[PDB]
Structure 1
Amino acid sequence: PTIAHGDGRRPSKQRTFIVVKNCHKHHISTEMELSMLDLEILHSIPETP
């Protein structure tokens, strides 16, 4: 909005501001090691205590 005046100035009209904001995506990745040995142990079946 805008005040009306009494003196002689160039009166700014009914302004309207369109403003936009864009999103930011964030990626995160860490690497964990797992050996082949314990994985191949996991893929088997146990029979001995």
Structure 2
Amino acid sequence: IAHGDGRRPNKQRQYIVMKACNKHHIGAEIELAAADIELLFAEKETPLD
């Protein structure tokens, strides 16, 4: 608050505080059949039934 007329503040304070990021670990598993990966990508790029 501004000065004057019987009002004496504890004049402007400034912190500088260094805080930490906190790491979090998330695991997931995807299982894929090897038949689909191989048939959808072939050297002979003729279309599929």
TM-score of the two chains, using structure 1 as the length reference: 0.45
TM-score of the two chains, using structure 2 as the length reference: 0.45
